[PDB]
Design a protein around this ligand. Sequence first.
Ligand SMILES: OC[C@H]1O[C@H](O[C@H]2O[C@H](CO)[C@@H](O)[C@H](O)[C@H]2O)[C@H](O)[C@@H](O)[C@@H]1O
Ligand SMILES: OC[C@H]1O[C@H](O[C@H]2O[C@H](CO)[C@@H](O)[C@H](O)[C@H]2O)[C@H](O)[C@@H](O)[C@@H]1O
Ligand code: FE
Ligand code: FE
Lengths: 192, 192
Amino acid sequence: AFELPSLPYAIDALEPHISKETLEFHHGKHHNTYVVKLNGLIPGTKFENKSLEEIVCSSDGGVFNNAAQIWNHTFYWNSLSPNGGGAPTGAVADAINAKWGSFDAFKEALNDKAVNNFGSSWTWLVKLADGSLDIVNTSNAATPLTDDGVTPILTVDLWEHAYYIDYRNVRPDYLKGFWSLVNWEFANANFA
Amino acid sequence: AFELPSLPYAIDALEPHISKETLEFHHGKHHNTYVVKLNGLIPGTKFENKSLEEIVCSSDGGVFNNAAQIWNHTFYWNSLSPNGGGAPTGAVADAINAKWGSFDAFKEALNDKAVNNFGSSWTWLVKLADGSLDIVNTSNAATPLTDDGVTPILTVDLWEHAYYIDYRNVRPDYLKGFWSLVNWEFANANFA
Ligand SMILES: OC[C@H]1O[C@H](O[C@H]2O[C@H](CO)[C@@H](O)[C@H](O)[C@H]2O)[C@H](O)[C@@H](O)[C@@H]1O
Ligand SMILES: OC[C@H]1O[C@H](O[C@H]2O[C@H](CO)[C@@H](O)[C@H](O)[C@H]2O)[C@H](O)[C@@H](O)[C@@H]1O
Ligand SMILES: [Fe+3]
Ligand SMILES: [Fe+3]
């Protein structure tokens, strides 16, 4: 059966951007629930002995919602670090300048995509077939993991549980937090 | 320009089922924002002189998400009451018995529709063209108001901001509060 991965850092490590309480609900409860629900839908079925990724790339309805959500959250914990934040570095820093002209223009373009991402959703930094970086929004459990030629680089969870405890309704406050946490090492790893 | 309607009861009137703070943010901020946004989008478009309902029934993209959310939230506040809850009465009570056999079968049916309504969404009690009752789910800003010959009777908001402050991730606890606040008079007024 699938397991809930351990968080890549201590539960208070993202303070004060993301609270210890948010992490216990978000990772300990929400992410956990997608794991048990998936574990509850696959016994006996054809997805029974497939990896998480084979499942999200070949499933539907409830099996897809849960498997994609487990995958999205794991990627999300990885896009954050108590050692991240600030200016981008390496390959991704230059790729960002190539597409948007400057990091600041990129921040503004992602923030705009994120605040207007209606309902439960995800905003992704992705690498396209032509080697270039782009920003795409998915809704509910959808993920670019399933689009040919699109490689997920970083993600920001915009479902309301991702920030309500800490920022209530103001997404820009949450996004300011994200930027202080962005894991550029994870980004560069996915990009290369 | 559209206006945020007043809450139909005091900000603490739904306690201990839905808190003063949820009402302050849910009505005071979330609902308001849909109003400001919609007002921001109408000038220079055909929706220039239309009624809220005319817009939601003939709109698309952003004009629709904002207008429908205003309509939906107005409908939701009316669907609760410091004096609701408990058993259904009058015509609605009997139609529920006609369709589901018992109030309890109906309640279990709606809870199941609601807890499984994935992402931001609404679970609705509607009166169909053939006169009978049914339960339908909509996602994000969708609403039965646009379904021809389908009459909205009661709704429960399942976007996370509707309950996260008071119940975090557990929708069933939120649903317990909803059944303690159901406004059967509004349901009967809408059904009649
Ligand atoms: O896993 C159960 C089902 O989840 C989804 O359907 C629910 O959520 C939808 C909105 O996201 C509602 O419209 C629907 O009424 C709910 O049943 C999924 O779409 C289904 O395929 C799953 O079986
Ligand atoms: O009002 C702004 C737009 O809202 C919707 O589009 C946003 O939300 C979608 C998810 O619900 C995203 O996929 C999309 O990227 C966002 O722009 C609406 O569909 C648009 O028509 C509105 O213009
Ligand atoms: Fe999440
Ligand atoms: Fe709401």
